[PDB]
Design a protein around this ligand. Structure first.
Ligand code: CHL
Ligand code: CHL
Ligand code: CLA
Ligand code: CLA
Ligand code: CLA
Ligand code: CLA
Ligand code: CLA
Ligand code: CLA
Ligand code: CLA
Ligand SMILES: CC1=C(/C=C/C(C)=C\C=CC(/C)=C/C=C/C=C(C)/C=C\C=C(C)\C=C\C2=C(C)CCCC2(C)C)C(C)(C)CCC1
Ligand SMILES: [Ca+2]
Lengths: 221, 208, 42, 73, 743, 80
């Protein structure tokens, strides 16, 4: 069992039953002694799961259109960096079929339905397949585990039908999530420092590792 | 009068309040602030919601139908917002005082029924007429229920009353919708509908 | 709810609401009839 | 109150300026300004950084009375 | 032993049931009132948490949520301030002509003729001139448009909501644990480095990016609307380089240690900027950077969970000598158990800090065009002085409270405190003698000067022209300060303040900002008066604290409580023996001290500094340098200060300053109103209420809540409250009228 | 590289890392008393290093190495 910067506090509760358990908690945040709001070790594992998943989509989709437009068929009108997409209007705003703000209201309504019902599987797991909802209720029952609900919608292919391969895939999801979470954090700081794009910065360092923006530390938009 | 435990709630997954058991029409367990916790406030606000719903449904039609046909080559009705500034066959204050006297009579007898059910169901001049309804907020009688769809079995009456409160809730939002629309926009609400249908992605609230 | 209404009936809150309504009324009276050292309607 | 009344009415009468009393005795800022403050001029200047006159014995007793009174507090 | 987050879930249910039950917190008060005294007790014991329960955890959670509520109210207050600056103010007009426009942020409604208070403040604005100084702050920060003040008010409203919600949360939901509150090392670490360090660093980051460039453009005369927005200095660094060239590098000298390049916008020139009259903004930003580094370092002294660091218990226990026994051992257990002890310490230190702020802000004006807004400066000084004095009196009160309630040698002993108690008699007798000596050798000199000036003997006075008592020490100190730049301070370009360095008179817009302050016999006498008054206040308060438990007169005073009227007419009379009454008298004496302090400040500034400067350099002060000859006399203070400068407030009727003329007399009224309570006792008043109750019961209109005269303690509390309110509001009206008229 | 600041910084750093790595300075497992005694504490925070150097004491030594480094560099640059 690999232990990375463990402590007598961390090893007391970090048991190894949680997926990706490397025994790392110098701050003792998953400490089960004084549990209240959001400082619940189950909620913290769910937070890493969801943050890692969304960051996997983020780490891909932020550097995806820039590389795609560099060498690809999708037109160069839509090929920009993630910060020049209209996310940050002062960094560059592209005009879609809506005014950005209406895109936000529409996405808040959609994410509202999805995330509210995802939370109802955390507060009362199983209750999301009881009230009428134009069908769809069966797959919204869950497997009891909030971070791993499964079902016909979210796990139709049945990967890891046994507990062994399920554990291995869970271990893989945890480390992929941590990798992509550090990735989008790197995108944030690189777009803050380099200001040219997540992939344009990588190309500046590939053909020129002597560049080294660390010693540079100058920032422009 | 018929409680329903597994009724579809406003917030699926949550627990309904102990004082909202589903016997009322349009019951979705929605009272997060507990405004109608005690039975006294519950029945008063039930009458308040019902009268609100009925007035707003009359108002929703009084806006959305004349404003619609006048946009077409049919009618000449002015704006509902500026309909007060108009001059009719007499000054507005006289119309309002007449309205106060006559509507005050109707609300006075309605108040007597709410505070004391059944004590007002007779005509004080011709006693043989009377009102047949037995529920508060549903007076019945020949005047207010001539077609007779209001004296029927339970469940059926509950279905119709659920329809009534739902349409009224939609109408209350509709009337307030037209209000804040004509304040935000400078045109009639039918122009807001057409402006949005012309460009749903841009002609929104984020247009100014 | 009943406890909330019982709180609104306590002496300071009833005093504020009563004196606020009283202050607003006297302000509007002196707004439509300012000054006035006498009872002019005789 | 009795003596503030008597002295102000007479000290304005003796000065031939009864209008100042008739117009300023109807509000208390007039009593503070046009009676105590105004008539204290020659008194408090009984002795100044530039010398003194025969009114200094009152400027001293004036402060003397302020001390005894405050000592009683 | 391992510092960690610890809370409980849902300890107290959220319900209005206890709202409807007055006095629910107390067991005797919850039964409802039998007499009217109940109504007062409900408010007197409303915040006495440690008397509602004995569980330290409940008390700590209540205190935490009370702090959150206070922060919510302060954020709401700031929201109101910024919103009034945005909506009902002439800040944009004051921004173009700061030397002629009067700052105003309140406009009254026209109802009963009060619109006269909307006076001509300049910039086409009718309002009330403000002395809080928010205009100077908003200019120093770089705010230009009303929109930015709007956004700041909205943010402050959101933060007030956040603080209120957090207060509800950490009491009704996730409510912290006792050990969590008691993790003192972690808390001090986060307050030194996290709160103060990172706060100073954030403000230094704002000042180097917004304050410095926008203020350069404001000093240059650029129109504020034609000034680039602050964020435009964060995108195109060409704009920042055109004003401060070092920004063209890009954090490279910081990492390579070529910090000498940053001397363009991080300077140590000192003094005042002659265009604005405030401290050089580059110096203030450099200051905040240094403060940030120092606090970020200091927030690492105390151990937490990683072995390295200190434990305060060891540091305390290790400090014991041959005079104090095993001193400091036990203090860590005291200060981690008693809230009142911490409150006493922090009130004392925060009040003294407020006084230090009052001095440092007048002698070193931090904001542009603050030094010439005489009203704002006088008001800031006086306000901070009063805050500090009150807070120190509260420190005394809570020290006495700890003595009565949390002190117990059988459980949490400390040798230093026991040794202090074992010679309280010597301490108090010596302080008494010092107070008598200072009273004779300061005020007695004033009486000597009065009696010599009245007898036609101006050479037998104590004066700069006769028997001189020069403050040689303070003069030599300010001279050493003047010569420090270039010698014992080579990096300093000018003096620390202008009151030190000879010459170097800074004036702004025809009015003086600062100049070297003279120090003579008058200053000596007044400083000794200040020392004497401070000593008598300290005597009262400390004597109340040390004798809170026992005395030769009452050996069981601690059983009577902290707040009790007396112990009977016996022993000759035992009135006002409680420590509460000692705080009650220390209030009067703190007033008597602070009033003389602020009057000294006012007369000194209006006589030897503030005034009008000529084109050729001729400075005529508001009063003709009359401080040296007139202030060495009580009659001079009566005539050349009060009688002369009260003219503006007694003449303000019919102008926009008439509200000050009304408050002058109203405060006189409430001050004299207090004397009815302070000079009388409740027995007479109860005997009067008896006949009044007869009159009521005759007409079937007597209340069930039997009327009762105020308690003895309540009599004194009302008396001192009204006395303080009247005196302070009188001085407030007088100061504001005088300085706004002649300013 | 590119300045004497590198030599002074790597000296103060590596020397302070050196004094904390082995004995000779207060570590996570070496607690100090009267300014000279180093009693042996159990830190609790695990580190792979067998002699006693921890990551908390690593960051501590690196920071103090930079404190002394910046102090010496700006002291020798402002004199000679
Ligand atoms: C949480 C994940 C995520 C989010 C928030 C976004 C958000 C965005 N994507 Mg991305 N993407 C994401 C993931 C990914 N994208 C892509 C591949 C692309 C492409 C190829 C393009 C975008 C584009 C866009 C932008 C406009 C979307 C649009 O036109 O939709 C409506 C379109 C529909 C088909 C519906 C927008 C800022 C467009 C753009 O302008 O990017 C700069 C664009 O052309 N994305 C991939 C690789 C499969 C992703 C993987 O996770
Ligand atoms: C449900 C009843 C009712 C409603 C919703 C309105 C609404 C309105 N009236 Mg009437 N009125 C109503 C009844 C009556 N009005 C009049 C006589 C007039 C006149 C003479 C005028 C109006 C005007 C107005 C408008 C004033 C706008 C405003 O900000 O008002 C104040 C805002 C409120 C009271 C808030 C209410 C909404 C809140 C629930 C959200 C407004 C759209 C004026 C107009 O046309 O303005 C353009 C006008 O001149 N009304 C009479 C007497 C016959 C009424 C009798 O019931
Ligand atoms: C300026 C100081 C002052 C004032 C205002 C008073 C006022 C009063 N004294 Mg008093 N007194 C004083 C000094 C003062 N005294 C001193 C120094 C002593 C020596 C110890 C005494 C000893 C004394 C005795 C022995 C007695 C009184 C009595 C009275 C009352 C007489 C009844 C009356 O005249 O109707 C009212 C007069 C007023 C001035 C009331 C003014 C206040 C009004 C009501 C303000 C209105 C409130 C308004 C809304 C403000 C809002 C406040 C907000 C914070 C809520 C009266 C309230 C006698 C008494 O009790 O009467 C039955 C009584 O026997 N006095
Ligand atoms: C769609 C809204 C709606 C619905 C579903 C109901 C339903 C009901 N109402 Mg109600 N009502 C409404 C709106 C509505 N009302 C409005 C806006 C008012 C104010 C004018 C009233 C005033 C009212 C009174 C005073 C009374 C009722 C009564 C009743 C009950 C009698 C049965 C009946 O005839 O149903 C309605 C059948 C329908 C098909 C819906 C009507 C649709 C209309 C005809 C459309 C007209 C378009 C418009 C003119 C433009 C019933 C449950 C009576 C009762 O309770 O009996 C005991 C009773 O006394 N209603
Ligand atoms: C870097 C960490 C940090 C920071 C910034 C603060 C900041 C503050 N603490 Mg705190 N504290 C900390 C750590 C920290 N604390 C730790 C580790 C402990 C021991 C476990 C304590 C225990 C403690 C107690 C017992 C009390 C405080 C109080 C306060 C407030 C003092 C009043 C003030 O200065 O007004 C200045 C106002 C501001 C600077 C505005 C900024 C406020 C921000 C938004 C708060 C963010 C810091 C917070 C700790 C982050 C967690 C919140 C997050 C989960 C949402 C202040 C805002 C007092 C209080 O409760 O006040 C309400 C008080 O009673 N603290
Ligand atoms: C918490 C305080 C704080 C904050 C939030 C910032 C934030 C920022 N600084 Mg800054 N800085 C600060 C303190 C701060 N600074 C202090 C105290 C100094 C004096 C040593 C500097 C000196 C400084 C320089 C010289 C530069 C920045 C720059 C920047 C920006 C570049 C960030 C990036 O893109 O990467 C950024 C917004 C750079 C910039 O302007 O980028 C546009 C830049 O040139 N800063
Ligand atoms: C952070 C500062 C702080 C804190 C937290 C406390 C906290 C506490 N103090 Mg304390 N105190 C402080 C500062 C502080 N004090 C200062 C600065 C002083 C010097 C004046 C005092 C002097 C003091 C005394 C003498 C006593 C306390 C007491 C208490 C305890 C009960 C408080 C209570 O319920 O009274 C209730 C509050 C009121 C009844 C409000 C009274 C109204 C005020 C006094 C006048 C309002 C005037 C207003 C400012 C402007 C006029 C507006 C008006 C016209 C509407 C409590 C734990 C009491 C105690 O029992 O100790 C355990 C006690 O007797 N304090
Ligand atoms: C103007 C009124 C007044 C005066 C003069 C005093 C004077 C004094 N107070 Mg006091 N006080 C007052 C109001 C006053 N108080 C009020 C209203 C309160 C209620 C809050 C208090 C509450 C209070 C407390 C709680 C205490 C004092 C204390 C003191 C003494 C401090 C020691 C000192 O200064 O020695 C010097 C003496 C003087 C300054 C008085 C003037 C002396 C003159 C200049 C000398 C003249 C001598 C001359 C030769 C006389 C001979 C003439 C012969 C023919 C008869 C002092 C005598 C403290 C104390 O006891 O002392 C340690 C103390 O504990 N006071
Ligand atoms: C080992 C080589 C070395 C050398 C040759 C220097 C040399 C120098 N240092 Mg330096 N320093 C060093 C190491 C060194 N330092 C290290 C390792 C650190 C990190 C701890 C520092 C941290 C440091 C700081 C923070 C400062 C200097 C400063 C200075 C310069 C003037 C200090 C002085 O004598 O004024 C005399 C100083 C006094 C007389 C202090 C008396 C006044 C005190 C503060 C009042 C007491 C109040 C009390 C603290 C409460 C000077 C050229 C100062 C500077 O930068 O000059 C511009 C400065 O501020 N050094
Ligand atoms: C494991 C390993 C090893 C070892 C290594 C080492 C030895 C390391 C180290 C070390 C290091 C790498 C160090 C460094 C550091 C740094 C740090 C730790 C930092 C920081 C920060 C801060 C906190 C700062 C601050 C400041 C100052 C000081 C002053 C003021 C300002 C400023 C901010 C600048 C070997 C090879 C054997 C083997 C393999 C691997
Ligand atoms: Ca925990």
């Amino acid at each position: 069992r690999p232990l990375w910067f463990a402590s007598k506090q961390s090893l007391s509760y970090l048991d190894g039953s949680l997926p990706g358990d490397y025994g790392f908690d110098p701050l003792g945040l998953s400490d089960p002694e004084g549990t209240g709001g959001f400082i619940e070790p189950r909620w913290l594992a769910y937070g890493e799961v969801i943050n890692g998943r969304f960051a996997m989509l983020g780490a891909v989709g932020a550097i995806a259109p820039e590389y795609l437009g560099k060498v690809g068929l999708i037109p160069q009108e839509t090929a920009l960096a993630w910060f020049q997409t209209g996310v940050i209007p002062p960094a560059g705003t592209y005009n879609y079929w809506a005014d950005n703000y209406t895109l936000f209201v529409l996405e808040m309504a959609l994410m509202g339905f999805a995330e509210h019902r995802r939370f109802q599987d955390w507060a009362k797991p199983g209750s999301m397949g009881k009230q009428y909802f134009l069908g769809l209720e069966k797959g919204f029952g869950g497997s009891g585990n909030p971070a791993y609900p499964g079902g016909p919608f979210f796990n139709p292919l049945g990967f890891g039908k046994d507990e062994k391969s399920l554990k291995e895939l869970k271990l893989k999801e945890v480390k992929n999530g941590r990798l992509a979470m550090l990735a989008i954090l790197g995108y944030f700081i690189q777009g803050l420092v380099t200001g040219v794009g997540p992939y344009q910065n990588l190309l500046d360092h590939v053909a020129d590792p002597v560049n080294n923006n660390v010693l540079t530390s100058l920032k422009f938009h | 009068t018929v409680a329903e435990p597994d009724r579809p709630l406003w917030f699926p997954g949550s627990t309904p309040p102990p004082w909202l058991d589903g016997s009322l029409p349009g019951d979705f367990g929605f009272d997060p602030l507990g405004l109608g916790s005690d039975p006294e406030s519950l029945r008063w606000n039930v009458q308040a919601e019902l009268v609100h719903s009925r007035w707003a449904m009359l108002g929703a039609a009084g806006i959305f139908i004349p404003e619609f046909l006048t946009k077409l080559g049919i009618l000449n009705t002015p704006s509902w917002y500026t309909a007060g500034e108009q001059e009719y066959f007499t000054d507005t204050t006289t119309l309002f005082i007449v309205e106060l006297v006559f509507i005050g009579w109707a609300e006075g007898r309605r108040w007597a029924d709410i505070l004391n059910p059944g004590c007002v169901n007779t005509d004080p001049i011709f006693p043989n007429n009377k009102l047949t309804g037995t529920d508060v907020g549903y007076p019945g009688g020949l005047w207010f229920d001539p077609l007779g769809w209001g004296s029927a079995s339970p469940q059926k009456l509950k279905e119709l009353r659920t329809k009534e409160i739902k349409n009224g809730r939609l109408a209350m939002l509709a009337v307030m919708g037209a209000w804040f629309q004509h304040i935000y926009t400078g045109t009639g609400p039918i122009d807001n509908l057409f402006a949005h249908l012309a460009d749903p992605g841009h002609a929104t609230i984020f247009a100014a | 709810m009943r406890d909330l209404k019982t709180y609104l009936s306590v002496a300071p809150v009833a005093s504020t609401l009563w004196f606020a309504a009283l202050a607003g009324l006297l302000i509007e009276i002196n707004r439509f009839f300012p000054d006035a050292l006498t009872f002019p309607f005789f | 109150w009795v003596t503030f009344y008597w002295h102000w009415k007479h000290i304005t009468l003796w000065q031939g300026n009864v209008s100042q009393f008739n117009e300023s005795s109807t509000y208390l800022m007039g009593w503070l300004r046009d009676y105590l403050w105004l008539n204290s001029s020659q008194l408090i200047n009984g002795y100044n950084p530039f010398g003194m006159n025969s009114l200094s014995v009152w400027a001293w007793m004036f402060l003397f009375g302020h001390l005894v009174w405050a000592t009683g507090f | 032993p391992e510092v960690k987050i610890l809370v409980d879930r849902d300890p107290i249910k959220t319900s209005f049931e206890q709202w409807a039950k007055p006095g629910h917190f107390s067991r005797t008060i919850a039964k409802g009132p039998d007499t009217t005294t109940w109504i007062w007790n409900l408010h007197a014991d409303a915040h006495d948490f440690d008397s509602h329960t004995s569980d330290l955890e409940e008390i700590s959670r209540k205190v935490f949520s009370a702090h959150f509520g206070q922060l919510s109210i302060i954020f709401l207050w700031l929201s109101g301030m910024y919103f009034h600056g945005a909506r009902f103010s002439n800040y944009e007009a004051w921004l173009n002509d700061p030397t002629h426009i009067r700052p105003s942020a309140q406009v009254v409604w026209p109802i009963v003729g009060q619109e006269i208070l909307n006076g001509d403040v300049g910039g086409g604005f009718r309002g009330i001139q403000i002395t809080s100084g928010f205009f100077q702050i908003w200019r120093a920060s770089g705010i230009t448009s009303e929109l930015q003040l709007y956004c700041t008010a909205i943010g402050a409203l959101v933060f007030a909501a956040l603080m209120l919600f957090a207060g509800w949360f950490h009491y009704h939901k996730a409510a912290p644990k006792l050990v969590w509150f008691q993790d003192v090392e972690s808390m001090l670490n986060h307050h030194l480095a996290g709160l103060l360090g990172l706060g100073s660093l954030s403000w230094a980051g704002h000042q180097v990016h917004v304050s410095l460039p926008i203020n350069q453009f404001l000093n240059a005369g650029v129109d504020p609307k034609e000034i680039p927005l602050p964020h435009e200095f964060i995108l195109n660094r060409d704009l920042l380089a055109q004003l401060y060239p070092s920004f063209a590098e890009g954090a490279t000298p910081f990492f390579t240690l070529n910090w000498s390049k940053y001397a363009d916008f991080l300077t140590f020139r000192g003094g005042l900027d002659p265009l604005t009259g405030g401290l050089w903004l580059t110096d203030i930003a450099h200051h905040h950077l240094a403060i940030a580094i120092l606090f970020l370092i200091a927030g690492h002294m105390y151990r937490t969970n990683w072995g390295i660091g200190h434990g305060i218990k060891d540091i305390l226990e290790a400090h014991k000598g041959p005079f104090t026994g095993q001193g400091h051992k036990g203090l860590y257990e005291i200060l981690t158990t008693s809230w009142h002890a911490q409150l006493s310490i922090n009130l004392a230190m925060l009040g003294s800090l407020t006084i230090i702020v009052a001095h440092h802000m007048y002698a070193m004006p931090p904001y542009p065009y603050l030094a010439t807004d005489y009203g704002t400066q006088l008001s800031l000084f006086t306000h901070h002085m009063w805050i500090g004095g009150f807070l120190i009196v509260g420190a005394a009160a809570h020290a006495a409270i700890f003595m009565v309630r949390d002190y117990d040698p059988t459980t949490r002993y400390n040798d230093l405190l026991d040794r202090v108690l074992r010679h309280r008699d010597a301490i108090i007798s010596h302080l008494n003698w010092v107070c008598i000596f200072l009273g004779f050798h300061s005020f007695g000199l004033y009486i000597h000067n009065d009696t010599m000036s009245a007898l036609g003997r101006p050479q037998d006075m104590f004066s700069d022209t006769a028997i001189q008592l020069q403050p040689v020490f303070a003069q030599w100190i300010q001279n050493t300060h003047a010569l420090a730049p270039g010698t014992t301070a080579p990096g300093a370009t000018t003096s620390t303040s202008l009151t030190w360095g000879g010459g170097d008179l800074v004036s702004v817009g025809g009015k003086v900002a600062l100049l070297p302050i003279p120090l003579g016999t008058a200053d000596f006498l007044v400083h000794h008066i200040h020392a004497f008054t401070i000593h008598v206040t300290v005597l009262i308060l400390l004597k109340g604290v040390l004798f809170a438990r026992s005395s030769r007169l009452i050996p069981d005073k601690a059983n009577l409580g902290f707040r009790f009227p007396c112990d009977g007419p016996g022993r000759g009379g035992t009135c006002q023996v409680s420590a509460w009454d000692h705080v009650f008298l220390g209030l009067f004496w703190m007033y008597n001290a602070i009033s003389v302090v602020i009057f000294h400040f006012s007369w000194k500034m209006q006589s030897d500094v503030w005034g009008s400067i000529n084109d050729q350099g001729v400075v005529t002060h508001i009063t003709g340098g009359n401080f040296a000859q007139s202030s060495i006399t009580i009659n001079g203070w009566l005539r050349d200060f009060l009688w002369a400068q009260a003219s503006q407030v007694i003449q303000s009727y019919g102008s926009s300053l008439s509200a000050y003329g009304l408050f002058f007399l109203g405060a006189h009224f409430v001050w004299a109103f207090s004397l009815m309570f302070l000079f009388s006792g409740r027995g007479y008043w109860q005997e009067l209420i008896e006949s009044i109750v007869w009159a009521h019961n005759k007409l079937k209109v007597a209340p069930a809540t039997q009327p009762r005269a105020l308690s003895i303690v309540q009599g004194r509390a009302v008396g001192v409250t009204h006395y303080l309110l009247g005196g302070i509001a009188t001085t407030w009206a007088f100061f504001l009228a005088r300085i706004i008229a002649v300013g | 590289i590119g300045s004497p600041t590198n030599l002074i910084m790597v000296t103060s750093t590596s020397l302070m890392l050196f004094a904390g790595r082995f004995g000779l300075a207060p570590s996570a497992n070496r607690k100090a008393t009267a300014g000279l005694k180093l009693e042996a504490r159990d830190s609790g925070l695990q580190t792979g290093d067998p002699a006693g150097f921890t990551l908390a004491d690593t960051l501590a030594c690196g920071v103090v190495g930079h404190i002394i480094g910046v102090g010496v560099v700006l002291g020798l640059k402002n004199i000679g």
